[PDB]
Curated annotation (Swiss-Prot), chain A:
Gene encoding the protein: rpoZ
Record-linked Pfam families: RNA_pol_Rpb6
Reactions catalysed according to its record: RNA(n) + a ribonucleoside 5'-triphosphate = RNA(n+1) + diphosphate
Assembly, per entry: The RNAP catalytic core consists of 2 alpha, 1 beta, 1 beta' and 1 omega subunit. When a sigma factor is associated with the core the holoenzyme is formed, which can initiate transcription.
Keywords: DNA-directed RNA polymerase, Nucleotidyltransferase, Transcription, Transferase
EC number: 2.7.7.6
Family affiliation: Belongs to the RNA polymerase subunit omega family.
Name of the featured protein: DNA-directed RNA polymerase subunit omega
Record-linked InterPro entries: DNA-dir_RNA_pol_omega, Pol_omega/Rpo6/RPB6, RPB6/omega-like_sf
Top-level taxon of the source organism: Bacteria
An example Gene Ontology molecular-function term: DNA binding
SMART domains on file: RNA_pol_Rpb6 (SM01409)
GO cellular component, one term: DNA-directed RNA polymerase complex
Curated annotation (Swiss-Prot), chain B:
Signal peptide: none
Subunit structure as annotated in this protein's UniProt entry: The RNAP catalytic core consists of 2 alpha, 1 beta, 1 beta' and 1 omega subunit. When a sigma factor is associated with the core the holoenzyme is formed, which can initiate transcription.
Protein source organism: Thermus thermophilus (strain ATCC 27634 / DSM 579 / HB8)
Name of the protein described by the UniProt record: DNA-directed RNA polymerase subunit beta'
Top-rank taxon, per record: Bacteria
UniProt gene name: rpoC
Membership in a protein family: Belongs to the RNA polymerase beta' chain family.
Free-text function comment from the UniProt entry: DNA-dependent RNA polymerase catalyzes the transcription of DNA into RNA using the four ribonucleoside triphosphates as substrates.
Shown residues within the full chain: 3 to 57 of 1524
From Swiss-Prot, chain G:
Part of the full-length chain shown: 1017 to 1237 of 1524
Gene giving rise to this polypeptide: rpoC
Binding site for Zn(2+) 2: C96, C178, C185, C188
Organism: Thermus thermophilus (strain ATCC 27634 / DSM 579 / HB8)
Function according to Swiss-Prot or TrEMBL: DNA-dependent RNA polymerase catalyzes the transcription of DNA into RNA using the four ribonucleoside triphosphates as substrates.
Name of the molecule in the record: DNA-directed RNA polymerase subunit beta'
Family: Belongs to the RNA polymerase beta' chain family.
Assembly mode: The RNAP catalytic core consists of 2 alpha, 1 beta, 1 beta' and 1 omega subunit. When a sigma factor is associated with the core the holoenzyme is formed, which can initiate transcription.
From Swiss-Prot, chain H:
HAMAP family: RNApol_bact_RpoB
Name of the protein described by the UniProt record: DNA-directed RNA polymerase subunit beta
EC number: 2.7.7.6
Role: DNA-dependent RNA polymerase catalyzes the transcription of DNA into RNA using the four ribonucleoside triphosphates as substrates.
Subunit-structure text: The RNAP catalytic core consists of 2 alpha, 1 beta, 1 beta' and 1 omega subunit. When a sigma factor is associated with the core the holoenzyme is formed, which can initiate transcription.
Family (UniProt): Belongs to the RNA polymerase beta chain family.
Organism: Thermus thermophilus (strain ATCC 27634 / DSM 579 / HB8)
Gene that produces this protein: rpoB
Keyword Cytoplasm set for record: no
Length: 94, 55, 101, 170, 147, 14, 221, 1112, 56
RNA sequence: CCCUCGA
DNA sequence: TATAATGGGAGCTGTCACGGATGC
DNA sequence: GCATCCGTGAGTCGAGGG
């Protein structure tokens, strides 16, 4: 099973809201090249290559683990969409 | 715009003629030697548009 | 002729471009724009006018020459030097070779 | 009918974890092929995409590094497994694929009961969710280990059966 | 179902049956534009009756109507759903004549048009949800704070 | 029902 | 520890009837007319049948097969009908706020019509578990509150109270009584039987219902 | 090795030729060997006799016909994709009535397909089989009215498309009604037309009270037969002018015309027998001396009234009874379509007699052969009873030729077929097998002919019985119809016999299918053998009596699915039918007469017979069958060997020394293994691959064409633009791959170039062209390449060129090249295995030999089967087969155990004892005692009640061995299996379903024209179908974007799919999906229906999904 | 003795807490050990394992 | 398409 | 472009349940 | 108010051959 899936289902009033949050966050991480991540270098999801451990390419993995850290804010009408876009482009260039 | 609805109703002959880019006057499809659409036929390029892009 | 209803499920569309083909043309246009960005604006524009990447058609040396306000020999020479720099850059980075099929 | 899909015979997976399924290498190579190309361009396996695709085209042109590349590609991702007929929603489930040798799809034992799947020669279809949204939906909602119970009853759906019960009882 | 050892929850059957009871027949038109014997949805006639009672008019007298799943399906408001189900010709004739509009409420309608279904992740309830990290959130907060 | 029969009858009128 | 006995008892494989056909007598058989033959197969599969026995048994088996196929077709049709009639139904809201409900009886009239006796556990469970109380229920010194999602333990407790004669029926929120338009609410639907918890808004319970009713259609004999 | 056979029942007669149904039907049909004057009026001769004479020159008549030699031999027809056929010439004479002029000529009617020696056909190079049809026999039937109790329906049924079904019913108002072509009218009218008078009807039918009074109508008897006739014609033909000759012609055509209305010979027979009358012709009435004369109707009505009244000697009919159901064989069907094409030919002939010069006409001028040819071609190609032959193994073909279908032309339509038709009738005994039949929708509709069963001249199936007189069983054998059978008391074949006399005072018999215990004095007849109850395939299952019918069925069918193996061996446990199955399938080669073998080769076998003549038998070698299985004959004899008549010269495919080999004999252990045999899955030893057990040869055909186009010709050449030498390496000078070359997916089988379509180069193409300074070539690479997942060694190349001797292709085609590729297939994971008892599974694991459970002597098992399969499936035959297989393993012998006659338990126990003596005796001889692990195991079994406490280890081990169980050591541990395990030899087949064929995956590929959705099929590299129910699934998970992905990006959304692919190769996220194209197609197809479909916003203002391109 | 029903109930309670998560894990464990012990058990089918009672 | 064969 | 020629020919069957109009 | 004819339905995916 997905790690801490239970706690995640506990976070939200509907499981589908969890899904949306996770997917959206994953898209944010893809877009900005994981420069917006709230995960400390030791908290980074890893992948075992032939060479050695590298960053987990999967943005949804990242999204869920981020979500579990309590460092993400979700909900409806938090901020204008274009304002969010522009500020994320500001802080983390693409 | 975003589609919020789908409507269906009867088509007036005037509406039908409004759709039409031409009348098909001939029961012809394609020429036997040239394999190209016959004029005023079911496959006519004059009516239903070009076979080749931008040509 | 015979009927599609005896059948047509086995009949592919050769007309519309495959996603692979379309992606290939896209990457082609983009790469071309890179290699042309490696040139000056005038010579790149001359190449685009002469090969018709702008309005869709190929202008003569008289039309491009009268466009930039020069002689046809001059504009042909510009086309040639542009093509030459393109050949040097391509020989160097070997980027556009794969698109030649 | 859809793209990014495949099918093959199913075979028992006993070593598999519940969230996993064996996916033949070739199948995975084809299904994920664009991702594989992009990854091959990210590493030094190919200068560009077209060269990489022309490289995968012939089977004798396929080397060892592309498989590791494919492994990197499918990491964390899930595929949809489906057996016909689909009577209820558990006719489709999500699995993190494990690349295997051979042409057969490996299926975890428990979920068999839901699929009404046995090893008398049943075949199954594979599907690849593309978007982050699709894969999120699949992993959270459609994962095998995330549905343990029947939506019809509320009794356990994935449960010990056959050999398992026999052993534990024994 | 019990006879065969199939454990099945009542509420599903209750869903279906609920859809079987979905329609009513008019015993008296009252002050409405409705006709005697005219069949419509219980919801619609209840709304109509609440409107007539709120207007001080005489409400519509109606009768409960039980129809099987096929008839209940074909009698639904969405012409797309009904036409896709079966008896396509009939459905389409009556729909075209009535100049019917499909509001795209259910799953079939949006599936045909290839839209995002109104269920699960597509639910208007959960689909407008936003996600932001505390850094970006605070930056935006300062942006709002300055003006 | 049958167009041929009908036209043949109509022809059998004259 | 006999293999057949072990497998049958455990639930790994086999039922008493199959075991009976192996060890015991094969049993009675039906004529093609549905009529039953007077002379049973006295033989087991262990001992082996005579060709006559085998022939009769063949009547039976053929009948069974035809039955199975035709059944598959009709069940499929039914399932699609159900999917078409129920598909617009989704959980669109938390509560419609209706005061309406249904009362699930814990007792059913005896066929002797002597008295009322307790309903079978599984059926009670099937009409109770995962539902929501429309009213306060106080039994055996326990408060089951209005709005409460009934757990399995809640159901079993209600059965205990029933046996103690404290409660003959349970008031419950139901899709039948839900005033939600185009779908049902959360409280009226109750649990998501897959997650053993309350149903998430956006769940399509119409399709889930259609599939739940449809899937064991080919098992119905 | 020594073969011990069991059973006490001596079969009086052997199995009849098993292909005889086909061969003799068609031989009866053509009558090619019969000199024309001696030909019977049956067959195509019949069709000629019905069609001719042709009148209104005035007259064209039929003299005789003949069949010439085939233009090409069978193999050559298969090669060139022709039809194996013979030319049909018919001698006709034209006669002018007035002139007296007679012009006679032999005209060419086209060809007719010739049936091969094994009962098949070659149609356009493909082997095909015409499957017999089963249908209700023509005749007069009486059935109970479902609505009205006590009332019955009379039904007069002729042959299919021989004219209408007629119903006679007694209406609630009392009048007797006749129903023809869905028209209800009083029968009395027709009775008047037939020339009957009220007097005759009163004396004849008056014996039945209150019945005949419904038949009395004064208005009908008030008019002569002519007036009544015209009345009937006015009733049956509204609006049509009631002319006298037109009415006479119509009714005569409906009833008395043999050219139109024909009861079968069978129909006539059954009518005569039922109604107790005699029919002059096969029609219901006659036209004689200007008036209609009755045959059928009055006896039919008489029987109806009699049955209605309760009069004894009158009963209803069972329409599923095999006395009332007959079989239409290949000859009858072919003859029917022949009659059709001939009728069309006749229409053409009269049409040609009306137009053209009247004085000069020849038969050649009047006859256009084409419609007949067209009819026959339609039959042998597009008919439903004409099926692609199953060549997978020989038994496949044999069974295919023995099939019976209720479907087809004139047959039942599915889903209208209830339980009754699929049911097993009591009359099925000895005739139609109760076991072999498909699973699913076709169940009971497709069936198989019993082993001893025969089809008679009237088309009824007959089964043999033995005469029993005074308790003495003779060798006299009588084949009976189901009716004749119902006339007798027939004892079972296992009935005790001392000499020819019945030794039991209580015998088991049947009376009308009803089982009954009777005296020897009462026994009229006795069964030939249990074999006669079952089909060929079902007869190949040993210990069948220990198997439940369903898994027996599975065993049969899967036996037909078995793949020929290079090393394939005959079963250790046989039913004894294997040799005959090989012989009758014409798979193997036999000696025609006694003689000495002169030459022996992998190619030919030359034999000198007693006549002194030298005959050379060529061997078919590595030929590709219809299903792609390898067909090759291996010589079984050596130079100088003395052979007698019927001895084996060579083994065919799936044959070992004349015995049918559908698979391998492997050593199995019944026990779970670590979840790998979970749910019917199977585990195998790698040793099986090492010695090449279950290894098969498969050949695939690849075909390309070079044709003339308007843009210039396609051509096969070694010059292919933009290709290296590496790709052209194995290509020969002409562009064809060389023999012996290994091909892999992507490799070129045949090089081909086609001129490019007219091309306006995109500006990018022009620029790039100018950059690399290379002219774009005129042609492009069309070459035929090896498809994904295929490949092998090229064993053959066929090239056919236009402008070359003996070669003329389709118009426009320059040449055709065929490439044959053979592949050797090892058994691999996903491949399907089965036994004859219905146990089937895919191999889920292949273990290295060191991981396999093994006997103490170090012998590893081959296959590991999970016991959990056995109890619910209730097939114990595999168990007994396993025990006896163990015995035969250590005794080095094979066994023949006839069904229901087979080896019983005690005999198997004896053999197992001997085997144990070999096993353990050898052990103790070698100087080793009992192993400790064996002791532990023995303690466990001692606790299990398997062995007697107090006995020595050897005694207990023997006790276990007789139970079929042995001590087994886990290969990974060395620790024994805690209990003893059943281990023995089992016969297992490798089924035709192989994962190599079935594995498919697609990223992107071809899309359909109109729908712009992915194509279906593996060959077309299609996408899987996501159907209504899968969409239901995704809806139920509530996954919206995955679903939307299925409905747009991955299928019919062009913008969406292109954007998606590009986004993914760029490394981006897939974009928002657009409108699906097939919905636009829906909008447009709805517009053509004059329906306006508008996509609107929330403000009800139109939205254009066509982006302006559809608007003016 | 552990059989179909008991194991099912185990999976259900466990399923509540141990639950979703550790019931995924528990399911896998039971699978493993179940298969192993089934293998070493000695389970097979002989013809003498179908036992005709004399009572018959 | 229909037929046949798989699930 | 001229003897006169003047109403066609297929037929094809062993299902069942519902709505709807149609006929005593 | 009750029989009778007419139209429309009757599981999925997969394979193969035509
Ligand atoms: Mg299966
Ligand atoms: Zn509610």
């Amino acid at each position: 099973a997905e790690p801490g899936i239970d706690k995640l289902f506990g976070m939200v009033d509907s499981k589908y809201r969890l899904t949306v949050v996770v997917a959206k966050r994953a898209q944010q991480l893809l877009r900005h090249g994981f420069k917006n991540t709230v995960l400390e270098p030791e908290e980074r999801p890893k992948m075992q290559t032939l060479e050695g451990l590298f960053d987990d390419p999967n943005a949804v993995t990242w999204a869920m683990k981020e979500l579990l850290t309590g460092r993400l804010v979700f909900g409806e009408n938090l901020v204008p969409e274009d304002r969010l876009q522009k500020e994320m482009e500001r802080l983390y260039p693409v | 715009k975003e589609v919020r609805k789908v409507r269906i109703a009867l088509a007036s002959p005037e509406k039908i003629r409004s759709w039409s880019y031409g009348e098909v006057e001939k029961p012809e499809t394609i020429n036997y030697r040239t394999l190209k659409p016959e004029r005023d036929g079911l496959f006519d390029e004059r009516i239903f548009g070009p076979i080749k892009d931008y040509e | 002729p015979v009927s599609l209803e005896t059948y047509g499920d086995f009949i592919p569309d050769e007309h519309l471009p495959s996603p692979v083909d379309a992606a290939t043309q896209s990457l082609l246009s983009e790469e071309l724009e890179k290699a042309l960005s490696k040139l000056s604006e005038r010579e790149a524009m001359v190449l685009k006018l002469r090969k018709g990447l702008i309005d869709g058609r190929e202008h003569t040396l008289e039309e491009v020459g009268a466009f930039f306000g020069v002689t046809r020999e001059r504009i042909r020479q510009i086309e040639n030097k542009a093509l030459r720099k393109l050949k040097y850059h391509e020989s160097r980075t070997r980027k556009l070779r794969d698109f030649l099929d | 009918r859809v793209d990014y899909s495949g099918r093959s015979v199913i075979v028992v997976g006993p070593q598999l974890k519940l969230h996993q399924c064996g996916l033949p290498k070739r199948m995975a190579l084809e299904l994920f092929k664009p991702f594989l190309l992009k990854k091959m361009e990210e590493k030094g396996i190919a200068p560009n995409v077209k060269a990489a695709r022309r490289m995968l085209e012939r089977q004798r042109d396929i080397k060892d590094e592309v498989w590791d590349a494919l492994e990197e590609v499918i990491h964390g991702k899930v595929v949809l497994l489906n057996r016909a007929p689909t009577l209820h929603r558990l006719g489709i489930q999500a699995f993190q694929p494990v690349l295997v040798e051979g042409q057969s799809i490996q299926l975890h034992p428990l979920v068999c009961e839901a699929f009404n799947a046995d090893f008398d020669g049943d075949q199954m279809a594979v599907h690849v969710p593309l978007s982050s949204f699709a894969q999120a939906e699949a992993r959270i909602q459609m994962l095998s280990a995330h549905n343990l119970l029947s939506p019809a009853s509320g009794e356990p759906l994935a449960k010990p059966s056959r050999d398992i019960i026999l052993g534990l009882y024994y | 179902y019990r006879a065969q050892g199939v454990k099945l929850h009542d509420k599903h059957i209750e869903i279906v049956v609920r859809q079987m009871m979905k329609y009513v027949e008019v015993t008296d038109p009252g002050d409405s534009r409705l006709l005697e014997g005219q069949v419509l949805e219980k919801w619609d006639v209840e709304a109509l009756n609440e409107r007539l009672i709120a207007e001080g008019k005489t409400p519509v007298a109606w009768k409960p109507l039980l129809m099987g799943v096929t008839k209940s399906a074909l009698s639904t408001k969405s012409w797309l759903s009904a036409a896709s189900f079966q008896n396509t010709t009939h459905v389409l004739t009556e729909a075209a004549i009535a100049g019917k509009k499909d509001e795209l409420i259910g799953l079939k309608e949006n599936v045909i048009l290839g839209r995002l279904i109104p269920a699960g992740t597509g639910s208007d309830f959960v689909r407008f949800t936003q996600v932001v990290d505390q850094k970006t959130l605070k930056a935006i907060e300062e942006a709002r704070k300055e003006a | 029902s049958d167009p041929v029969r009908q036209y043949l009858h109509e022809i059998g009128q004259v | 520890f006999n293999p057949l006995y072990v497998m049958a008892q455990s639930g790994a494989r086999g039922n008493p009837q199959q075991i009976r056909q192996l060890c015991g007598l094969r049993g009675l058989m039906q004529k093609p007319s549905g009529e039953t033959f007077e002379v049973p197969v006295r033989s087991s599969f262990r001992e082996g049948l005579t060709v006559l026995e085998y022939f009769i048994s063949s009547h039976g088996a053929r009948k069974g097969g035809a039955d199975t196929a035709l059944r598959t077709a009709d069940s499929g049709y039914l399932t699609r009908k159900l999917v078409d009639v129920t598909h617009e139904i989704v959980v669109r809201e938390a509560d419609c706020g209706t005061t309406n409900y249904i009362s699930v009886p814990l007792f059913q009239p005896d066929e002797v019509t002597r008295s009322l006796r307790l309903r079978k556990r599984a059926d009670i469970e099937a009409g109770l578990y995962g539902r929501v109380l429309a009213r306060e229920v106080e039994v055996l010194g326990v408060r089951l509150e209005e709005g409460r999602y009934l757990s399995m333990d809640d159901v079993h407790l209600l059965i205990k109270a029933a046996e103690a004669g404290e409660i003959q029926e349970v008031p419950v929120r139901s899709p039948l009584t839900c005033q939600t338009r185009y779908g049902v609410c959360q409280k009226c639907y109750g649990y998501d039987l897959s997650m053993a918890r309350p149903v998430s808004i956006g769940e399509a319970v119409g399709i889930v219902a259609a599939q739940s009713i449809g899937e064991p259609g080919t098992q119905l004999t | 090795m020594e073969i011990k056979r069991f059973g006490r029942i001596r079969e009086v007669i052997p199995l009849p030729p098993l292909t005889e149904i086909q061969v003799e039907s068609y031989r009866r049909a053509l009558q090619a060997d019969v000199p024309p004057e001696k030909r019977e009026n049956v067959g195509i001769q019949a069709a000629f006799r019905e069609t001719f004479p042709i009148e209104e020159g005035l007259v064209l008549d039929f003299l005789e016909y003949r069949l010439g030699e085939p233009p090409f031999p069978q193999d050559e027809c298969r090669e060139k994709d022709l039809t194996y056929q013979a030319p049909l010439y018919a001698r006709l004479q034209l006669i002018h009535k007035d002139t007296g002029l007679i012009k006679e000529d032999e005209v060419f009617l086209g060809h007719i397909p010739l049936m091969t020696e094994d009962g098949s056909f070659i149609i356009n190079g493909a082997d095909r089989v015409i499957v017999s049809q089963i249908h209700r026999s023509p005749g007069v039937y009486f059935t109970p009215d479902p609505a009205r109790p006590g009332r019955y329906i009379a039904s007069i049924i002729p042959l299919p498309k021989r004219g209408p079904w007629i119903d006679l019913e007694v209406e609630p108002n009392g009048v007797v009604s006749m129903k023809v072509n869905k028209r209800k009218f009083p029968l009395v009218l027709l009775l008047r037309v037939l020339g009957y008078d009220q007097e005759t009807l009163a004396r004849e039918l008056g014996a039945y009270g209150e019945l005949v009074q419904g038949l009395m109508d004064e208005s009908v008897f008030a008019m002569r037969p002519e007036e009544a006739l015209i009345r009937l014609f006015t009733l049956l033909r509204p609006g049509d002018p009631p002319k006298r000759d037109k009415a006479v012609a119509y009714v005569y055509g409906l009833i008395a015309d043999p050219r139109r209305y024909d009861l079968g010979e069978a129909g006539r027979y059954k009518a005569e027998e039922k109604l107790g009358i005699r029919l002059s012709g096969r029609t219901l009435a006659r036209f004689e001396d200007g008036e209609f004369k009755d045959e059928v109707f009055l006896p039919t009505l008489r029987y109806l009234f009699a049955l209605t009244a309760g009069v004894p000697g009158h009963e209803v009919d069972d329409i599923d009874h095999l006395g009332n159901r007959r079989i239409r064989t290949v000859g009858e069907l072919m003859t029917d379509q022949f009659r059709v094409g001939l009728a069309r030919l006749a229409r053409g002939v009269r049409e040609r007699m009306l137009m053209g010069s009247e004085d000069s006409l020849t038969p050649a001028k009047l006859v256009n052969s084409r419609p007949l040819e067209a009819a026959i071609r339609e039959f042998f190609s597009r008919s439903q009873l004409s099926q692609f032959k199953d060549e997978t193994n020989p038994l496949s073909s044999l069974r295919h030729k023995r099939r019976i279908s209720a479907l087809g032309p004139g047959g039942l339509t599915r889903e209208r077929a209830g339980f009754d038709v699929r049911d097993v009738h009591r009359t099925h005994y000895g005739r139609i097998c109760p076991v072999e039949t498909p699973e699913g929708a076709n169940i009971g509709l497709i069936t198989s002919l019993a082993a001893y069963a025969r089809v008679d001249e009237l088309g009824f199936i007959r089964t043999p019985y033995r005469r029993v007189v005074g308790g003495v069983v003779t060798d006299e054998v009588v084949y009976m119809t189901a009716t004749e059978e119902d006339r007798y008391t027939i004892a079972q074949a296992n009935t005790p016999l001392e000499g020819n006399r019945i030794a039991a005072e209580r015998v088991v018999a049947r009376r009308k299918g009803e089982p009954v215990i009777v005296s020897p004095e009462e026994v009229e007849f006795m069964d030939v053998s249990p074999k006669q109850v079952f089909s060929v395939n079902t007869n190949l299952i040993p210990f069948l009596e220990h198997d439940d019918a369903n898994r027996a069925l599975m065993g049969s069918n899967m036996q037909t699915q078995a793949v020929p193996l290079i090393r394939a061996q005959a079963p250790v446990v046989m039913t004894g039918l294997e040799e005959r199955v090989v012989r009758d399938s014409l798979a193997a080669l036999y000696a025609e007469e006694d003689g000495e073998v002169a030459k022996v080769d992998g190619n030919r076998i030359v034999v000198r017979y007693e006549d002194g003549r030298l005959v050379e038998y060529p061997l078919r070698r590595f030929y590709r069958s219809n299903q792609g299985t390898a067909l090759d004959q291996r010589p079984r004899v050596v130079v100088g060997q003395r052979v007698r008549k019927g001895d084996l010269l060579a083994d065919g495919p799936a044959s070992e020394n004349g015995f049918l080999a559908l698979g391998q004999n492997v050593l199995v252990a019944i026990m779970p293994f670590d979840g790998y045999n979970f749910e019917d899955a199977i585990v195998i030893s790698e040793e099986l691959l090492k010695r090449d057990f279950y290894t098969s040869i498969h050949i695939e055909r690849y075909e390309i064409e070079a044709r003339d186009t308007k843009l210039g010709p396609e051509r096969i050449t070694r010059d292919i633009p933009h290709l290296s030498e590496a790709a052209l390496r194995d290509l020969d000078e002409e562009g064809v791959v060389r023999i012996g070359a290994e091909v892999k997916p992507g490799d070129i089988l045949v090089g081909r170039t086609s001129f490019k379509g007219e091309s306006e180069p995109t500006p990018e193409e022009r620029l790039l062209r100018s950059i690399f300074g290379e002219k774009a070539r005129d042609v492009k690479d069309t070459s035929l390449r090896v498809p994904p997942g295929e490949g092998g060694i090229v064993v053959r190349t066929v090239r056919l060129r236009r402008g070359d001797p003996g070669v003329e292709l389709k118009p426009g085609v320059r040449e055709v090249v065929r490439v044959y590729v053979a592949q050797k297939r090892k058994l691999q994971v996903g491949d399907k295995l089965a036994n004859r008892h219905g146990n089937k599974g895919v191999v889920a694991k292949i273990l290295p030999v060191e991981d396999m459970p093994h006997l103490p002597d170090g012998t590893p098992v081959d296959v590991i089967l999970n016991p959990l399969g056995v109890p619910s499936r209730m097939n114990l035959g595999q168990i007994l087969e396993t025990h006896l297989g163990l015995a035969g393993y250590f005794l080095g012998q094979r066994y023949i155990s006839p069904i229901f006659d087979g080896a019983k338990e005690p005999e198997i126990k004896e053999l197992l004892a001997q085997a144990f003596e070999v096993y353990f005796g050898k052990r103790k001889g070698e100087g080793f005692g009992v192993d400790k692990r064996e002791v532990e195991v023995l303690r466990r079994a001692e606790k299990l009640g398997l062995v007697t406490p107090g006995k020595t280890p050897e005694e207990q081990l023997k006790e276990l061995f007789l139970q079929g169980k042995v001590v087994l050591y886990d290969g990974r541990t060395g620790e024994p299996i805690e209990g003893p395990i059943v281990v023995g030899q089992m016969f297992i087949m490798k089924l035709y379903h192989m994962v190599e064929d079935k594995m498919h995956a697609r990223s992107t590929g071809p899309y359909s024209l109109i729908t712009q959705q992915p194509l279906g099929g593996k060959a077309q590299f299609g996408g899987q179908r996501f159907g209504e129910m899968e969409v239901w699934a995704l809806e139920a998970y509530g996954a919206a974007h995955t679903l939307q992905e299925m409905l747009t990006l991955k299928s019919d959304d062009i913008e969406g799919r292109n954007a998606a692919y590009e986004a993914i190769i760029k490394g981006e996220d897939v974009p928002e999906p657009s409108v699906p194209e097939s919905f636009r197609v829906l909008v447009k197809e709805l517009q053509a229906l004059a329906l306006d479909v508008q996509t609107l916003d929330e403000k009800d203002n139109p939205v254009d999904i066509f982006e302006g391109l559809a608007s003016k | 003795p552990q059989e179909k029903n008991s194991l099912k109930d185990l999976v259900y309670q466990a399923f509540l807490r141990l639950g979703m998560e550790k019931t995924a894990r528990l399911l896998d464990a039971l699978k493993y050990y179940g298969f192993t012990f089934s293998t070493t058990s000695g389970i097979t089918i002989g013809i003498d394992d179908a036992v005709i009672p004399e009572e018959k």
